């Protein structure tokens, strides 16, 4: 289909309780495939999907080395950030990095990413050109200047256009049973009386993969955006996701309301109504 690969990294300092904890996970689309936690008994990058297990020791050795090296650099960078922001050493701080690539149906690069956040706020991001930077503030500009001096973007571009795309292709093929299978939503509408005067209609979508979905209510064909309660798409724990959308309907109006569902696993968008 269109597809993505992402690596997520978080270091959280904890002054007086040892060294910062480092956790990194890798995803293809919405499927977790690798993990590393510095607080693990014997930290190694570990597989989380059957299709990666076939990779050889050379792969795992290099992944684990990379993980450990980043834990170390993140610790140095956390120290640097205290200086850049004129901060005390007493508090816990957070440093995050996301990078990866999006590819289209033909396997060609659509977009690459490489960006960081400090204490939950944008710090520095590689622009879509894979050649220039956006620094959030005058502290990040210090890093920008160093990274421009060292031609960092050129090195990241090479990865994002190269190994990122090629290895994502490989994973898609090795994991084609699951990664290239869309599970459509199982859908139904439920009715929950609130009072004599009104009831909730809740439109459910269950057991779908990947997570992207659109769930809408209309009344007399008009979208009910402002009156629809829409929950965040949530993991079921069996690889699939769930979502619902609910509206409060006056008694006897239920047939004016229609639930509309779009998912890549569906050949045509669905229309549902409450069926007493």
């Amino acid at each position: 289909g269109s597809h993505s690969m992402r690596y997520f990294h978080t270091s959280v300092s904890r002054p007086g309780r040892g060294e910062p904890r480092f956790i990194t996970v890798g995803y293809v689309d919405d499927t977790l495939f690798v993990r590393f936690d510095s607080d693990a008994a014997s930290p190694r990058e570990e597989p989380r999907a059957p299709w990666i297990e076939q990779e050889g020791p050379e792969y795992w050795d290099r992944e684990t080395q990379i993980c450990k090296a980043k834990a170390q650099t993140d610790r140095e960078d956390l120290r640097t950030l205290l200086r850049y922001y004129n901060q005390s050493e007493a508090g816990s701080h957070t440093l995050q990095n996301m990078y990866g690539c999006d590819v289209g149906p033909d396997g060609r690069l659509l977009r690459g990413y490489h960006q960081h956040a400090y204490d939950g706020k944008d710090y520095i991001a590689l622009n879509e050109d894979l050649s220039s930077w956006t620094a959030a503030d005058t502290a990040a500009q210090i890093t920008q200047r160093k990274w421009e001096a060292a031609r960092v973007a050129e090195q990241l571009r090479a990865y994002l256009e190269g190994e990122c795309v090629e290895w994502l292709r490989r994973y898609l093929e090795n994991g084609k049973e699951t990664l290239q299978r869309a599970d459509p939503p199982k859908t139904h509408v439920t009715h929950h009386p609130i009072s004599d005067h009104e009831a909730t209609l809740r439109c459910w979508a269950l057991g779908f993969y990947p997570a992207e979905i659109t769930l809408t209510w209309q009344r007399d064909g008009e979208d009910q955006t402002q009156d629809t309660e829409l929950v965040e798409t949530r993991p079921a724990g069996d690889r699939t996701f769930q979502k619902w959308a609910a509206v409060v309907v006056p008694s006897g109006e239920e047939q004016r309301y229609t639930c509309h569902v779009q998912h890549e696993g569906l050949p045509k968008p669905l229309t549902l109504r409450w069926e007493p």
Partner: protein
């Protein structure tokens, strides 16, 4: 220091059928900082040995985690998720409702 309070959903993997084994999930999302404490409760007491996902985060940098355990729902047993986070003055308890 910006802080974002967790969204919390408590729900089952499969539609609840009394007497049939299932999984109880507590999904916490949209939060910062990452430090958070989550318990799943059965009749007000903490369920032991609950598992959880590894820390990850969304496009806007906010964090998410899934806590989960096997459970067998019944008519009478009450389940809940209890969350603590720096943004909360007291722990937030969200009861499991099989209709949500």
């Amino acid at each position: 220091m910006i802080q974002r309070t967790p969204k919390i959903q408590v729900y089952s993997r499969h539609p609840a059928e009394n007497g049939k084994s299932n999984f109880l999930n507590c999904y916490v999302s949209g939060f910062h900082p990452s430090d958070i404490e989550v318990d799943l409760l059965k009749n007000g007491e903490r369920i032991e040995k609950v598992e959880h996902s590894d820390l990850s985060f969304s496009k806007d940098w906010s964090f998410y985690l899934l806590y989960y355990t096997e459970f067998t729902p019944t008519e009478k047993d009450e389940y809940a998720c209890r969350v603590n986070h720096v943004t909360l003055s007291q722990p937030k308890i969200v009861k499991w409702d099989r209709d949500m």
